[PDB]
Design a binder for this molecule. Structure first.
Ligand SMILES: Cc1ncc(COP(=O)(O)O)c(CN)c1O
Length: 365
């Protein structure tokens, strides 16, 4: 009975939502998409939302809508999923990778500010693992230098920063991928406070069609989310508080279990926040633990326990190593070689949980 690091919280509600859409006959983008967008605006407090086929697609059209291209620079952490770096590169722009806090894995204002040049056209902070980045300082940077801030909120559905939801202001991209806090297998949504920007996003995710009877105003891609999938996301969104509460509860126990273990969890940010607990990441330093990260992951798999690696720093991956050979980001690299994600999902039981706790104890000796 293998225990994966994540399982989607699919139940009767999700099946019923699909059935309703199948029975209606309107299976691709339509009313369920509009409902999901309205729901995300209510959830976050922002004004406009555009549902898309993935958070990667959302990042692509957000950067494209800003007119990012050849010659432009986009500041981003290397400690993030490679999709953002790929989208920057594929638009013809130059990714400028900066380091992150050694204990929270989040991009610092200092590191961002040091990398700003006249060619900087966007800054993309990541709300890592469910915790929020330092938005006040980051927006301050954006305002001072006149550079748009696009938040990567893929890990942050349910995250709050100093009393306000992530996505309440500015622009933020959320994900409905299978391991995320809410899922429809694949999907995402861009929430924004700018109406002209939102209109551009809606056109770019559906062939560049717009009303000048719709016709191509400027070429765009096909990134629309089917109503079949949007209805699943809507059913999951209705359960968000319960689902995140179960994640937070399991986080607490891990925290308690870590007191008697050598593995080091991430540090919480110093600012006021609500953590979505998308991931429970531990650092496995060979010298301190007596076992390496890769060895630990393999040992756990022998015991029938899955783990995740979120993430192998983008600048250490083949394409990026060869393109940016001199790039060194010490805190990112230190963490990249030592992090791993322990099983954490809404339906996880204590049979599962202490199965993991006792597997760690075996390995710690
Ligand atoms: C930090 C981050 N940003 C962007 C993405 C892309 O998400 P999607 O799978 O929805 O395209 C991910 C995927 N897990 C991610 O973890």
């Amino acid at each position: 009975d293998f225990l994966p690091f994540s399982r989607p919280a699919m139940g009767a509600e999700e099946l019923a939502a699909v059935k309703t859409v199948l029975d209606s006959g309107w299976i691709t983008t339509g009313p369920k998409n509009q409902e999901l967008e309205a729901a995300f605006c209510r959830l976050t407090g922002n004004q406009y939302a555009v549902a898309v086929s993935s958070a990667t697609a959302g990042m692509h059209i957000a950067l494209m809508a800003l007119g990012i291209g050849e010659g432009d620079e986009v500041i981003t952490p290397s400690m993030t999923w490679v999709s953002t770096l790929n989208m920057i590169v594929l638009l013809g722009a130059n990714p400028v990778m900066v380091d992150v806090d050694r204990d929270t894995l989040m991009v610092t204002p200092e590191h961002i500010e040091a990398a700003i040049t006249p060619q900087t056209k966007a800054i993309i902070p990541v709300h890592y693992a469910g915790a929020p980045a330092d938005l006040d300082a980051i927006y301050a940077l954006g305002e001072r230098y006149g550079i748009p801030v696009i938040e990567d909120a893929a890990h942050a559905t349910g995250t709050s920063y100093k009393g306000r939801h992530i996505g309440a202001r500015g622009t933020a991209i959320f994900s409905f991928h299978a391991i995320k806090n809410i899922t429809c297998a694949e999907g995402g949504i861009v929430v924004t406070d700018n109406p002209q920007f939102a209109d551009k996003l809606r056109s770019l995710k559906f062939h560049g069609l717009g009303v000048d009877q719709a016709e191509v105003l400027a070429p765009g891609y096909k990134y629309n989310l089917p109503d079949l999938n949007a209805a699943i996301a809507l059913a999951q969104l209705q359960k968000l508080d319960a689902l995140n509460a179960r994640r937070a509860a399991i986080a607490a126990q891990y925290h308690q279990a870590m007191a008697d273990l050598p593995f080091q969890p991430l540090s919480l940010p110093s600012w006021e926040h609500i953590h979505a607990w998308h991931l429970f990441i531990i650092r496995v330093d060979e010298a301190r633990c007596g076992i390496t990260r890769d060895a630990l992951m393999a040992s756990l798999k022998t015991k029938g326990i899955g783990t995740g690696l979120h993430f192998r720093a983008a600048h250490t991956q083949k394409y990026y190593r060869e393109r940016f050979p001199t790039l060194t980001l010490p805190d990112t690299e230190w963490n990249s070689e030592r992090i791993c994600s322990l099983p954490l999902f809404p339906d996880m039981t204590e049979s599962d949980f202490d199965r993991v706790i006792t597997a760690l104890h075996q390995i710690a000796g």
